[PDB]
Amino acid sequence: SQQVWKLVIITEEILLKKVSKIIKEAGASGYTVLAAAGEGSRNVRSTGSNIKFEVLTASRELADQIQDKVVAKYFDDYSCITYISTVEALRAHKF
Amino acid sequence: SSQQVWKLVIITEEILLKKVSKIIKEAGASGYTVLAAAGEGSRNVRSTGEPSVSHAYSNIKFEVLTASRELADQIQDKVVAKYFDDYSCITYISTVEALRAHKF
Amino acid sequence: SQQVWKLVIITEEILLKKVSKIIKEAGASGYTVLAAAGEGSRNVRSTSHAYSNIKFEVLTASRELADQIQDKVVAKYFDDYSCITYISTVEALRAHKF
Ligand SMILES: Nc1ncnc2c1ncn2[C@@H]1O[C@H](COP(=O)(O)OP(=O)(O)OP(=O)(O)O)[C@@H](O)[C@H]1O
Ligand SMILES: Nc1ncnc2c1ncn2[C@@H]1O[C@H](COP(=O)(O)OP(=O)(O)OP(=O)(O)O)[C@@H](O)[C@H]1O
Ligand SMILES: Nc1ncnc2c1ncn2[C@@H]1O[C@H](COP(=O)(O)OP(=O)(O)OP(=O)(O)O)[C@@H](O)[C@H]1O
Numbered sequence: 001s002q003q004v005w006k007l008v009i010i011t012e013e014i015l016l017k018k019v020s021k022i023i024k025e026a027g028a029s030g031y032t033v034l035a036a037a038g039e040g041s042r043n044v045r046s047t048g049s050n051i052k053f054e055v056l057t058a059s060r061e062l063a064d065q066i067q068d069k070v071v072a073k074y075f076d077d078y079s080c081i082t083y084i085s086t087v088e089a090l091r092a093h094k095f
Numbered sequence: 096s097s098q099q100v101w102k103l104v105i106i107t108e109e110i111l112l113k114k115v116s117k118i119i120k121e122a123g124a125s126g127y128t129v130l131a132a133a134g135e136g137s138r139n140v141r142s143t144g145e146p147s148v149s150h151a152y153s154n155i156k157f158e159v160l161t162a163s164r165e166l167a168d169q170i171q172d173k174v175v176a177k178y179f180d181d182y183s184c185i186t187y188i189s190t191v192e193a194l195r196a197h198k199f
Numbered sequence: 200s201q202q203v204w205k206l207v208i209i210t211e212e213i214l215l216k217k218v219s220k221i222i223k224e225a226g227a228s229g230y231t232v233l234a235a236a237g238e239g240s241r242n243v244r245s246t247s248h249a250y251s252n253i254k255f256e257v258l259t260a261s262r263e264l265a266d267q268i269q270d271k272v273v274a275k276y277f278d279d280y281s282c283i284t285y286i287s288t289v290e291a292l293r294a295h296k297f
C-alpha cells in the first residue's frame with residue numbers, strides 16, 4: 001500500500017464537466033464521481049441533486065490545488081462542500 | 096485555513112430516508128449528503144424480509160459532517176436507538192479536514 | 200467505540216457479482232455498493248460520465264482481513280479490468296461486530 005490524500009468535492013450535478021476538467025488539468029491520475037442528494041445551510045444552489053467526487057493524489061499540493069480552484073470558482077455561486085483525508089492505496093496504481 | 100471535523104456515516108434501508116433525514120436536521124446538523132446503495136450484512140434484520148435481494152438498491156448511505164463530536168454521536172445515538180433492532184442499518188465515524196469556510 | 204478498517208474497491212460495474220463473492224467467500228460480515236463513474240490513467244476497461252463503475256465499501260474488524268480481500272481482488276482482476284482500492288480506519292459502535 002501507499003499513503004495518499006483523498007479529496008472529496010460534493011457539488012451541483014450541473015458542474016460535472018467543469019470540475020472533471022479542473023481535476024484532469026491539474027494532473028490527477030483520475031477521479032471517481034457518485035450521484036448524490038443532500039441539504040446544506042448556505043442556500044446558494046444555482047438552480048433555486050448533487051455529485052460527489054473522490055480524487056486520490058500522492059501529493060498534498062495537488063489535492064490543495066484542485067480544492068483551491070474548485071472553491072475559488074464555484075463556492076460563492078453553487079452548492080459546494082469539500083474535505084480531505086488520507087487513505088492507503090494500492091501500489092499498483094500511480095497517484 | 097482548515098478545520099478538523101467529524102464525519103458520521105449511516106447506511107440503512109431506503110425506506111428510512113425521510114425519518115433519518117429529519118433526525119439529522121432536528122439535531123442541528125448544517126446539512127447531510129445521501130447516496131443510494133446496495134449491500135449485504137450479517138445481522139439479517141431487513142424489515143422487508145430475508146433472504147433479501149443482494150444487488151437491489153434498497154439502501155441509502157448518509158454522510159453528516161459536524162464540527163462537534165457531541166452532535167455526531169447525538170445523531171448516531173438516536174438513529175441506532177430507534178432503528179438498529181428493527182431495520183438493517185450500520186454506522187461509523189471518522190475525521191476529515193474541511194475548510195473553515197462551511198459552518199459545520 | 201471501536202476502531203475498524205474500511206476497504207474501498209472501485210471497479211467496473213460488470214464485476215459486481217464476482218467481487219461481491221470474493222468479499223463474501225473471504226469472510227467479511229457485509230459490504231456496501233454504490234453506482235459510480237470516473238476516469239483513470241491505465242485505460243484497461245474491458246468493455247466517461249456514464250455510471251459504468253461500482254464503489255464497494257467493506258468494514259472489517261481487522262487490518263488483516265481488509266488486506267486479504269484487497270489482495271484477492273487485485274490478484275484476479277487488476278490486470279484485466281479497471282480497478283483501484285484503498286483502506287482507511289473509522290470508529291464503529293460495539294453494537295455491531297465486523
Ligand atoms: N454538514 C454536512 N454534512 C454532509 N454534507 C453536507 C453538509 N453540508 C452540506 N452538505 C452537502 O453539500 C451540499 C451543498 O451544501 P451547501 O451548504 O454548500 O449549499 P446549499 O445551497 O445549502 O445546498 P442545498 O441546496 O442542497 O441545501 C448539500 O446538498 C449536501 O449534499
Ligand atoms: N461489514 C460491512 N461493511 C460494509 N457495509 C456493511 C457491512 N455490514 C453491513 N453493511 C451494510 O449495512 C447494511 C445493513 O446490514 P445489517 O447487517 O445491519 O442488516 P442485514 O439485514 O443483514 O442487511 P441485508 O438485508 O442487506 O443483508 C447492509 O446491506 C450493507 O449495505
Ligand atoms: N486518482 C484517482 N482518484 C480517484 N479515483 C480514481 C483515481 N484513479 C482512478 N480512479 C477510479 O478508478 C477507476 C479505474 O481506473 P483505472 O486507471 O484503474 O482504469 P481505466 O481503464 O483507466 O479507467 P477508465 O476506463 O474509467 O478511464 C476509474 O474509472 C476511476 O473511477
Ligand SMILES: [Cl-]
Nearest residue numbers: 034052130233
Ligand atoms: Cl460514497
